[PDB]
Structures are given as structure tokens and as C-alpha cells.
Assembly symmetry: C5
Homo-oligomer: 174 residues x 5
């Protein structure tokens, strides 16, 4: 028994920007702030990561995955940990899990947008059917931008490391 | 013969709140609470109720242990709820039931709290127009007799002697149509969302 | 021997705060707190008072255990209060009373705070009305739109019906409990 | 022979903060922090300093146990403070004296901050009065040379600013919810 | 045998943050975050690093113990930082040490970021003035004093001296202590 520990935090503005712009494009000044977006992402992460963790404990060969606030009482950072049989085993699995979550959340979040790109086209292809016009021609520019952006399956990250998972030097006290 | 089952639940997403969020705009527009806020209020209402059920259940004659705690001690969401029982699927069954129980219990309270708002809005809006059109009549009956005070510009005054109102009052009457024609499906209002469904305990607890 | 009764309480209903909140609009228009903010205020004053009582009851020669805590840990509301006593009925009884004690005690301080200002603005508004009345006539020798506002707001101020049965600083989520079983000795 | 005294303390009420809040409006108007925000900031300062005292006192040869913790664990206000001492009446007196000690200490540190914000607004207001004047009068001379070959309130503000001396005696950083108690039982170890 | 030094730290004051905020009030102008927001971000950045240091220091062959926890439990600031070491004075100095070892580490990432931002704003206003010189040409091609403030600022930006030794991400509330007693089993 050896525990690897990573420390993680909300994705930085850079890591969101792609997704956040898409939201501006689609929603103007009703689009949520950058800050809120990062906050939402790490929320989504932790929330899913703690499910992984109940699940991992609820099996024949049980595993201890862990998410807690690094400074007890402070929203960020979050420090995650994992136990495995060998020092390098932990250090590698944690990382794998952190990524496993990230990916799975991210995927779902990309789905939301690629859904909204088509679900809020039904207001853009629905102003052409309203005509067939002064402020009305701005809708033509917005639909051009809602076409100009492409949500690549590698843009969104819902977390950022503060400390990459550790190689434990000592083994766990039993 | 004690096994806990746990679930992880969070605030309801926007879609599950659509119904109630709309009706709140229709009835209020500007001062109407943001989706964010509604979402929060809902989960808050759930968690509060579930923590009461919890207390009830422990003060039963035939004691039950149902719990609610923050999944990441310190973070507001998600909440992880758990329940101990006779058998593994007993726990898993009952957890779920109890979750719907609270959900529903609260969903009803909301639906009631809404039809209560439908009442108090209409009461004032009808009473506003009943004061607006009691005097916008009167002030136009004053004019038809303050001009009928004939003699200061003589012949032309007899030509001085069909109501159209502000588009401010025209809007109010149009919204009060929507507010009086607001339909509340209690089966549409959902108060929490799953992160993880109640678990089927593989092991068994013991101290 | 020792029995613990337990209520669960929360911030007052939007409706339960309505009169008070209104009275603050009439008295302050845009510096007047949101309903939501009065709600949170009120319960905060409840729990602070309730905390104090608790501490006092423990500092008696004849020791009493009254406690307040967040029902879901590290989640603001609801709060669950509890009382220990010698009989299950007695525990339930005394709790509800203490909750009421606190409620009323806070309410009447908040009442007295508002009735300070019904009295206080009827002084600060003749000092803007009857001051602008004779000071108009100093322009007549050597009427304002803001003056009628002052007149109107004062008219509203005197309409205010605030009996100390206005203020309610908490609502139950669950009324005190009748404990089947006593404490683990 | 150990006896714990206990006060419960909260943010100071709107009135005890009157001057300082007004003074903050005088210099910033619509961008001044809310009354509420000041109140919060004040008690936050009290608290932080109180916990310093507390750590300091527990590092004497002559150890003293003075503490501060939220009264409702998990809820920001009120917070309850306690002090242990040798004689019951001795605790109650010292606790209150300490509460007063911190209060005062902090008030002074806020007095300074008022002054520092005066002397930093002044030099940004004047430097924007001068830069609006001597760069828009060089636009009046780029209209005269084109013809050839409420900011007065910002000064009024500045006079109110100049006439904003605020007494030290007004500022209180906490309000009691419960004045420190006289312990009836003694502590059991 | 084993001794514990303790410091209490907070968010940095306006003064310590001025240098950095001024620079943001230039290049982002009115989209610059509030000082409140800046101070907040700083101490956040600090503690995040402090708790990483702590994680590393425990992992060393000879384990080392560095601590960060909220001074008043469940209150945001102040933080209580602490260090254990063999000797009294040694635990004091090495705390202080590890504290500045972080303050620096952070300031340097913040210098790196401001640098990066300067390089973006310069190139974002180069790319604007290369189109504005396609419109300044256009002015007397068919035959504002507002966009002459854009080039006027993009010089304050071009200037900006911001040395990483003038960026402080924490303030002491209490300097690391000299432990009178040793610890205990």
C-alpha cells in the first residue's frame, strides 16, 4: 500500500477561452463570465470524481480514490489521492483516473455545445422564415459566427494541476 | 445484517427547472430570479427536507438511518445521501424510494407556492387597472366639464367637447392574460438530479 | 434519565417578511434591502441569539444543554436545534418555548428598531418639507419637484401598519421532536 | 484553578460604522463598498487580529489560553471568544480587557487606512483634474490652430474630501451579542 | 527534540499590490479586475503553492512537516502556517524561509504572466493600428482624436517597469514565532 497525491485546481482562463467564446457567440451578454465558466468546470470535475471514488470502493477488489479540499475550508485547491500496490503503480493510476474523469466530463460538455450549436440554429433559420429589416440583419452576422467556430474534441479541460501526482517515497503505515 | 447504500445527487439542471423558471418570468420578468438561483433554491429545498426525513427516521420506534452530507467536505455540491438496511438490495431499493419521496414532497410544496404567487400577482394587477381606469375615466370627465365651463375662447371651446391608454397599461393587460393562463404541471417540476444512482453494496458494514 | 428533543429550523418565508421589507422600501427606496437579504438577516439574528441563550444555559448552577448547528454540515441552512431534559415530553416542551423565547426577543428588538424610524423620518421629512416651504419665499424676494416626492413618501410612511406581530425571524422545517428512547448513558 | 470566560461577538452594527462608511462614499460615490461590505470587512479584521493575539499569548513562558471560533461551526458570524484564568472573576475581567485591547488596536489601524486613502485619492483626482484640463485645453488650441494655419463637482468632492476629518473615537470594530460571562463551575481536565 | 514555529498570514494589502494593479489598469483600462479581486487572487495563488510545498516536503526521504490551515476554522483568512524542526530558532528561521521561498516562486509566475499579457496587448494593438493605417490612408483617399488615445496608452504599456521583487502575494499578520516550549507525544 502506497499513496500517490496530486493537487488540482480550476482550469485557467487560457484552458477555457475556446468554450467561453462559443458561449459569447451563442448568447451575447447573457453568456456567463469567464470566471464562472472555470468555476463550473472544476465543479463538474470534482462532482464526477467523487462518484468515481464511491464506485471504486464498491467492488470486489476495492480501491481508495480520494478528493478533499487541500486547505480544509477553502474552495480551491483540491487535493486528490490514490492507493495502489506499488509506488509507481499509484503515481500512474492516479494520473490515469484524473484524466479518465477529465475526459469523460469534457466529452459530455462538448455534447452540450454541439447540441446548442444546432438547438440555437432554430432561432437563426427561424428569422429567415420570419422575413420570407434593420436590427434584423445582425442575426445574419451572429449565425455566420455560430458557423465560424468549431468545437474540437480537445479544447475543453475541466481542471489544471498544481502538483502532478507524487511518487511516494515511504509505504503506508498499517 | 446492516448494509449502507449511497447515492450522489446535485442541483437540478436548467432543463428540469424550465417549467418553473418560465412561469416565474411570465409572472415577473425583470425582478424574476435567474435560472442559477432557481436551481440553487430547489436543491436547497430538497436537502433541507431530506435532512428532516433523516431526523424523523431516527426517532422512529423501528429506527432507520438515512443521512445527507456534502460529498467533498467543504463544497456545497454534490451531496451524497446514504441509507442502511436489512439486505443489500433492501438499502438500494429504499434509498431510491426515499429520494423520490422527498423529491415529490417538495415538488408539491413548490407547485403550491407558485399557485400562491399566481393569486397575489393577479390581485394587484387587476387592482392597479381598477385604479388606473377609475381615474383615467374621471380625469377625462373632469376635462369634459372643465372645458364645459364654456366662455374664455368661446365658439372654438364647443369643438373641444373612444379611450386609448399608454402602451405601459397595454403591456400589463397583455401579461395578465399570460399570468392568468399559466399551466402548472407538478409532474414537470424536478428538484435534484443524480450524479450517481444508489449503490448496490458489495461488502457489508460492521464496527 | 436524559432525553433529547430536536427541531429543524430555517430562514423565514418570503411572505413572512413582506411587511417589514415593504416598510423599508417606503422608508428607503433603493437602499432598502432585497426580500432575500432581509430573510438572511433575520435568521442570522435568530441563530446569534439562540447561540447566546445556549451559552447562558450552560453557565447556570443548574446546567441546561441547548444546542444549535447546521443540519447539513458546512451548508448554511437549515439549522437544527436541540434540547436535553429529564422527560421526553418536558424536553419537547421546553425546546419549543426556548425557540419561541428567542424568536420573540429578537422580533421585539427589530420591531422597536423599525418604530424608531417611523418616528425618526416624520422628523427628517418636515425638515425637508416645512424647511423648503418658508425657504421658497426667500427666492420670492432675494415649489420644487423633489419637494412633492418628500410629501408623497411621508404620506406612505404614515400608512405603515407595523404591530410587533409583523416580525418572525425563523420558520420550522420540522417542529421539536418527541423522543422515543433516551440518551445513550 | 482554571476558569473559562466567554463572550459572543459580532460585526459592528451600521450605526457604529456610520462615519467610516460616509467617509468612504465621500471619496468614491457609487464605487464605494456597500455598508454591509464594510461591516463584514471590519469584523474580519477584528477576528484576524484576535487570532494573532491568541497565538502570541500561547507562546509566553506565562501561557494564556485565549481563543476565537465561529459560534455555529460552519457559519461566519457570530463568533465566540473565550479566555482561561486563575480566578473566575479574573477571567471575565481580562477577557473583556482583551476584547477591548484588540478592538482599539484595529480601530487605529483603520484610522491610518482612511488617511492613506485620502492621500491617494487626492493625488489621482487632482492628477485627473489637471490631465482633463491641460489635454482638453490642448484640444481647444488644436481647434484655434485649426482656425489658424459635472467635473466642477470633482473639485466640490475634493472640498468635502478636504473637510472629511474623522475622529478615532467613533470607530468600533465589533458588537457584543453576549458580554463575557462569569464561570460558575471550574474547568474539568 | 521537535519544535513548532507558527506564522499567521493574509491577503496582501493595496500598497503591496499597487505596482501590479496599476499595470493592469493600464493595459486593460476599465476591464482590469478590482484590487479586491487582485489581492484575493494573490493569496489564493500563495496558499495553493504553499500546500504543494507541503505535499513535497512530506514526501522527502527524511520527512519534513509544513502546515497550512485556516486560523479561525471555517473562516477564509487568515491562514496559519507552521513548521516543525529539531531546534527552536531553527524551526523559526526555516518557516520564514519556506514562506519567502513561495512568495518569490509565485511573484515570478506573475511576472511571467504580466510579460505575456504585455506581449499580447502590444501585438493586439499592433494588429489594430495596421488596419487603422489602412483607414488613416483612407481618410484622404476619397477626397479621430479618440483613436489617438489608443496609441497614446500603448506607450504607457510599452513602458511599464514591473520587477518581480515588487510583487508580494501575502502579508504577515504575525511573523513566525520563537517557540518557548518543545512539542509533546
Amino acid at each position: 500500500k502506497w499513496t500517490s497525491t496530486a493537487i488540482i485546481t480550476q482550469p485557467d482562463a487560457a484552458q477555457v477561452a475556446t468554450y467561453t467564446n462559443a458561449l459569447n457567440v451563442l448568447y451575447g451578454g447573457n453568456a456567463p463570465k469567464i470566471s464562472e465558466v472555470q468555476a463550473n468546470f472544476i465543479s463538474r470535475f470534482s462532482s464526477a470524481f467523487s462518484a468515481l471514488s464511491e464506485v471504486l470502493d464498491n467492488q470486489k477488489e476495492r480501491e481508495k480514490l480520494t478528493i478533499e479540499q487541500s486547505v480544509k475550508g477553502q474552495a480551491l485547491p483540491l487535493s486528490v489521492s490514490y492507493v495502489s500496490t506499488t509506488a509507481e503503480g499509484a503515481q500512474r493510476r492516479l494520473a490515469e483516473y484524473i484524466q479518465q474523469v477529465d475526459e469523460e466530463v469534457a466529452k459530455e460538455l462538448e455534447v452540450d455545445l454541439k447540441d446548442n450549436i444546432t438547438l440555437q440554429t432554430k432561432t437563426l433559420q427561424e428569422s429567415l422564415e420570419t422575413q420570407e429589416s434593420p436590427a434584423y440583419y445582425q442575426t445574419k452576422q451572429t449565425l455566420l459566427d455560430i458557423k465560424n467556430l468549431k468545437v474540437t474534441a480537445d479544447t475543453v479541460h475541466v481542471y489544471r494541476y498544481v502538483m502532478k501526482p507524487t511518487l511516494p517515497v515511504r509505504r503506508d503505515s498499517p
